[PDB]
Structures are given as structure tokens and as C-alpha cells.
Design an enzyme around this catalytic site. Structure first.
Site, PDB file in Angstrom:
ATOM      1  N   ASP A   1       9.944  -3.145  16.189  1.00  0.00           N
ATOM      2  CA  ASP A   1      10.740  -2.090  15.517  1.00  0.00           C
ATOM      3  C   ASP A   1       9.907  -0.813  15.278  1.00  0.00           C
ATOM      4  O   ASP A   1       9.945  -0.196  14.206  1.00  0.00           O
ATOM      5  CB  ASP A   1      11.321  -2.629  14.199  1.00  0.00           C
ATOM      6  CG  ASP A   1      12.538  -1.833  13.704  1.00  0.00           C
ATOM      7  OD1 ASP A   1      13.136  -1.085  14.500  1.00  0.00           O
ATOM      8  OD2 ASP A   1      12.887  -1.954  12.510  1.00  0.00           O
TER       9      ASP A   1
ATOM     10  N   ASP B   1       6.706  -1.789   8.063  1.00  0.00           N
ATOM     11  CA  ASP B   1       7.994  -2.481   8.223  1.00  0.00           C
ATOM     12  C   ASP B   1       7.925  -3.608   9.275  1.00  0.00           C
ATOM     13  O   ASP B   1       8.403  -3.438  10.403  1.00  0.00           O
ATOM     14  CB  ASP B   1       9.096  -1.472   8.595  1.00  0.00           C
ATOM     15  CG  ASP B   1      10.490  -2.061   8.439  1.00  0.00           C
ATOM     16  OD1 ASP B   1      10.586  -3.266   8.115  1.00  0.00           O
ATOM     17  OD2 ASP B   1      11.497  -1.337   8.640  1.00  0.00           O
TER      18      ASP B   1
ATOM     19  N   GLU C   1       0.840  -1.193   0.000  1.00  0.00           N
ATOM     20  CA  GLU C   1       0.000   0.000   0.000  1.00  0.00           C
ATOM     21  C   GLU C   1       0.882   1.251   0.000  1.00  0.00           C
ATOM     22  O   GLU C   1       1.839   1.339   0.786  1.00  0.00           O
ATOM     23  CB  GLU C   1      -0.932  -0.011   1.214  1.00  0.00           C
ATOM     24  CG  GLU C   1      -1.749   1.254   1.434  1.00  0.00           C
ATOM     25  CD  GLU C   1      -2.527   1.237   2.760  1.00  0.00           C
ATOM     26  OE1 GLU C   1      -2.469   0.235   3.529  1.00  0.00           O
ATOM     27  OE2 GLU C   1      -3.195   2.249   3.047  1.00  0.00           O
TER      28      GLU C   1
ATOM     29  N   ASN D   1       9.291   4.089  10.565  1.00  0.00           N
ATOM     30  CA  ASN D   1       8.451   2.940  10.216  1.00  0.00           C
ATOM     31  C   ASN D   1       6.961   3.228  10.448  1.00  0.00           C
ATOM     32  O   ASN D   1       6.130   2.327  10.382  1.00  0.00           O
ATOM     33  CB  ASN D   1       8.893   1.692  11.016  1.00  0.00           C
ATOM     34  CG  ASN D   1      10.199   1.084  10.505  1.00  0.00           C
ATOM     35  OD1 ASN D   1      10.612   1.329   9.373  1.00  0.00           O
ATOM     36  ND2 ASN D   1      10.830   0.247  11.332  1.00  0.00           N
TER      37      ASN D   1
HETATM   38  N1  LIG Z   1       4.272   2.136   1.472  1.00  0.00           N
HETATM   39  C1  LIG Z   1       5.101   3.221   1.532  1.00  0.00           C
HETATM   40  N2  LIG Z   1       4.697   4.474   1.164  1.00  0.00           N
HETATM   41  C2  LIG Z   1       5.526   5.546   1.242  1.00  0.00           C
HETATM   42  N3  LIG Z   1       6.805   5.476   1.687  1.00  0.00           N
HETATM   43  C3  LIG Z   1       7.327   4.282   2.105  1.00  0.00           C
HETATM   44  C4  LIG Z   1       6.473   3.066   2.034  1.00  0.00           C
HETATM   45  N4  LIG Z   1       7.213   2.042   2.497  1.00  0.00           N
HETATM   46  C5  LIG Z   1       8.440   2.538   2.806  1.00  0.00           C
HETATM   47  N5  LIG Z   1       8.508   3.870   2.576  1.00  0.00           N
HETATM   48  C6  LIG Z   1       9.727   4.719   2.798  1.00  0.00           C
HETATM   49  O1  LIG Z   1      10.901   3.897   2.629  1.00  0.00           O
HETATM   50  C7  LIG Z   1      11.590   3.739   3.875  1.00  0.00           C
HETATM   51  C8  LIG Z   1      12.074   2.296   4.072  1.00  0.00           C
HETATM   52  O2  LIG Z   1      10.977   1.362   4.094  1.00  0.00           O
HETATM   53  P1  LIG Z   1      11.055   0.086   5.107  1.00  0.00           P
HETATM   54  O3  LIG Z   1       9.919  -0.816   4.646  1.00  0.00           O
HETATM   55  O4  LIG Z   1      10.934   0.706   6.476  1.00  0.00           O
HETATM   56  O5  LIG Z   1      12.499  -0.521   4.783  1.00  0.00           O
HETATM   57  P2  LIG Z   1      13.549  -1.185   5.856  1.00  0.00           P
HETATM   58  O6  LIG Z   1      12.904  -2.498   6.198  1.00  0.00           O
HETATM   59  O7  LIG Z   1      14.784  -1.315   5.015  1.00  0.00           O
HETATM   60  O8  LIG Z   1      13.562  -0.180   6.979  1.00  0.00           O
HETATM   61  C9  LIG Z   1      10.593   4.175   4.942  1.00  0.00           C
HETATM   62  O9  LIG Z   1      11.259   4.655   6.117  1.00  0.00           O
HETATM   63  C10 LIG Z   1       9.790   5.248   4.215  1.00  0.00           C
HETATM   64  O10 LIG Z   1      10.571   6.465   4.156  1.00  0.00           O
HETATM   65 MG   LIG Z   2      13.325  -4.438   7.347  1.00  0.00          MG
HETATM   66 MG   LIG Z   3      12.154   0.567   8.130  1.00  0.00          MG
END
Ligand SMILES: Nc1ncnc2c1ncn2[C@@H]1O[C@H](COP(=O)(O)OP(=O)(O)O)[C@@H](O)[C@H]1O
Ligand SMILES: [Mg+2]
Ligand SMILES: [Mg+2]
Ligand SMILES: [NH3+]Cc1ccccc1N1CCC(CO)CC1
EC number: 2.7.11.1
Length: 261
Positions: free
Chosen positions: A130, A148, A85, A135
Site C-alpha cells: 500500500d 501504514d 512515532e 502513507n
Molecule cells: N505518525 C504520524 N505522524 C504524523 N501524521 C500521521 C502519522 N500517522 C498517520 N498520520 C496522518 O494520518 C493519516 C492516516 O494514517 P494511516 O496510518 O495511514 O491510517 P489508514 O490506515 O486509515 O490509512 C495519514 O495519511 C497521515 O496524514
Molecule cells: Mg490501514
Molecule cells: Mg493510510
């Protein structure tokens, strides 16, 4: 079924440790979404296949307005792709950088949305582990969404980056349960009001010290009600931390939050 060929890729939304996340649009439906890209070489080197599997299985089955949806995944010999999403108003982290501090109403409202989502998680015995501003994402109406699930698991349980949100039992490699998420909730409530987390420090080794000792103080502007809640959540003994229900019904939360349990 899904392949890279099915999507048009747009701008970078953010960067993670393995994750590199992009805006994307599905070609046949024009559905806008987020594509989280992980490099297999880096996954294999770090040996974190198992927690990637957890992330997909746990997040794809959860259904709550305050939890980010995960739709599916695919991979292509160099990369894994998680289909998410899209959260159009970005991270709480960015909002905090913009404003320096949140007022009590904005803080209590975010804490209510968080506690609702965590209450739903814990009822399925899922612990996130986390919770931190990078996140936490924001929907089109500015509502908070937990994302996350890369560190999440089932409780009970044993176990590279920042210690700032972790409780004493977890940083000491000991055993832990759902109460780890209540500690992190306390850390977050403090950081929202004050602009920095309560055990922040220049080195890993000393942050570790401040956390294991629960060594924190409040600036003068933090009110008595906020102090009472944060002090109840940051207890060294996990069993002394409140239930999420007591958080949602805390007088300071009910007086200041603009959303219901
Ligand atoms: N669904 C999303 N919509 C908008 N931004 C996102 C989304 N998912 C991640 N991000 C951005 O990307 C970054 C890293 O995503 P994340 O899933 O937290 O990766 P990691 O597991 O490497 O921390 C987030 O901190 C946010 O800035
Ligand atoms: Mg991760
Ligand atoms: Mg993250
Ligand atoms: N099959 C993709 C893949 C490639 C390399 C490393 C880990 C992974 N997975 C993570 C997601 C899992 C979902 O079932 C499948 C295993």
C-alpha cells in the site's frame, strides 16, 4: 499497562478509513507521539481484525531509519489505539499538493530512501502492498518514512479504495509477491515528476483497464533517464521488473539523488 489516562490528546494529524490519528503527549515522560484510533464496531463490521494484528506485529519488529516506528497498543471496549512515532513534517501527499510536481533531485532522493526501506522489508520477506503518497511521512530532517503497514504480509500470497498504485496481478485477484512493491515504486516515480499517477481515470472500471493493459504515456518534459527507469518498473510480467539493487544503482538515480544506498 497503557491506557488513555496516560496521555494528553492534541490536534488531529489526519484521517484514515478506520484510523483517526492525533498528536499526543505521554504524561509522565512528556514524550510526544502519534495516537492512531480505530473504532471496534467498524473493525468488527469490516472484518479486518487480522490485518490490524499484522500491522502491529510486523511494524513493531522492523528497525530502519526510513520506516516509521510502532511502539505499542492498547484498547478500551469501543476503540483500539496504536502508539506511533510522530512524523513532524507531515505527508509526501501534502508536499505534492503544495508544489504540484517535484524536480528530478527531490524525486530521485525520495526514490532512494524508499528503495532502501523496501530492500530491508523484502530481506525479511515482508511486502508492504500500500505504497502511496498519503502513507509516506516526513521526519524532522525531511527524510522519508514508510508508514501504514495495515495491508502488509509475508510472501507468497493471494488476497475498497483507489486502484491507482496496484499492479495487474493484484487487481486481477491473482497471486503475487515482492514485485508488487516495485510496480508501486514505478507509479510513484511517475506521479512525483508529473503530478498525477500514470493510470488515473474517471472511473474504477476504466482505471482497471488502463492498469491491466499498462496503457500510459509521458509528457515531453520527462527526461530519457526517468523514462528508462519508469518503463523498467511498470512491466506487466512481475518477473521482468528489476531488483531493488538495480533501482538504487540506476544511472538516473545515482546522478540525481542526494542520499546513498
Ligand atoms: N505518525 C504520524 N505522524 C504524523 N501524521 C500521521 C502519522 N500517522 C498517520 N498520520 C496522518 O494520518 C493519516 C492516516 O494514517 P494511516 O496510518 O495511514 O491510517 P489508514 O490506515 O486509515 O490509512 C495519514 O495519511 C497521515 O496524514
Ligand atoms: Mg490501514
Ligand atoms: Mg493510510
Ligand atoms: N485486543 C484488541 C482488539 C479488539 C478488537 C478487535 C481486534 C483487536 N486486536 C488487534 C490488535 C491485536 C494485537 O494483539 C489484538 C487483537
Amino acid at each position: 499497562q497503557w491506557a488513555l489516562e496516560d496521555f494528553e490528546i492534541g490536534r488531529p494529524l489526519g484521517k484514515g478509513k478506520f484510523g483517526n490519528v492525533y498528536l499526543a503527549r505521554e504524561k509522565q515522560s512528556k514524550f510526544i507521539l502519534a495516537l492512531k484510533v480505530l473504532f471496534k464496531a467498524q473493525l468488527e463490521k469490516a472484518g479486518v481484525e487480522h490485518q490490524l494484528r499484522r500491522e502491529v506485529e510486523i511494524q513493531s519488529h522492523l528497525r530502519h531509519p526510513n520506516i516509521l516506528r510502532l511502539y505499542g497498543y492498547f484498547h478500551d471496549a469501543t476503540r483500539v489505539y496504536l502508539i506511533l512515532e510522530y512524523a513532524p513534517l507531515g505527508t509526501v501527499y501534502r508536499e505534492l499538493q503544495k508544489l504540484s510536481k517535484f524536480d528530478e533531485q527531490r524525486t530521485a532522493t525520495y526514490i532512494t530512501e524508499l528503495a532502501n526501506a523496501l530492500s530491508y522489508c523484502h530481506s525479511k520477506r515482508v511486502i508492504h502492498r500500500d505504497i502511496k503518497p498519503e502513507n509516506l511521512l516526513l521526519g524532522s530532517a525531511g527524510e522519508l518514512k514508510i508508514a501504514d503497514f495495515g495491508w502488509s504480509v509475508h510472501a507468497p500470497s493471494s488476497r475498497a479504495g483507489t486502484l491507482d498504485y496496484l499492479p495487474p496481478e493484484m487487481i486481477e485477484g491473482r497471486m503475487h509477491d515482492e514485485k508488487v512493491d516495485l510496480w508501486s515504486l514505478g507509479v510513484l516515480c511517475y506521479e512525483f515528476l508529473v503530478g498525477k499517477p500514470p493510470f488515473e481515470a474517471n472511473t474504477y472500471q476504466e482505471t482497471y483497464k488502463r492498469i491491466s493493459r499498462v496503457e500510459f504515456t509521458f509528457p515531453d518534459f520527462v527526461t530519457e533517464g526517468a523514462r528508462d527507469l519508469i518503463s523498467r518498473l511498470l512491466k506487466h510480467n512481475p518477473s521482468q521488473r528489476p531488483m531493488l539493487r538495480e533501482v538504487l544503482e540506476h544511472p538516473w538515480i545515482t546522478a540525481n539523488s542526494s542520499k546513498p544506498s
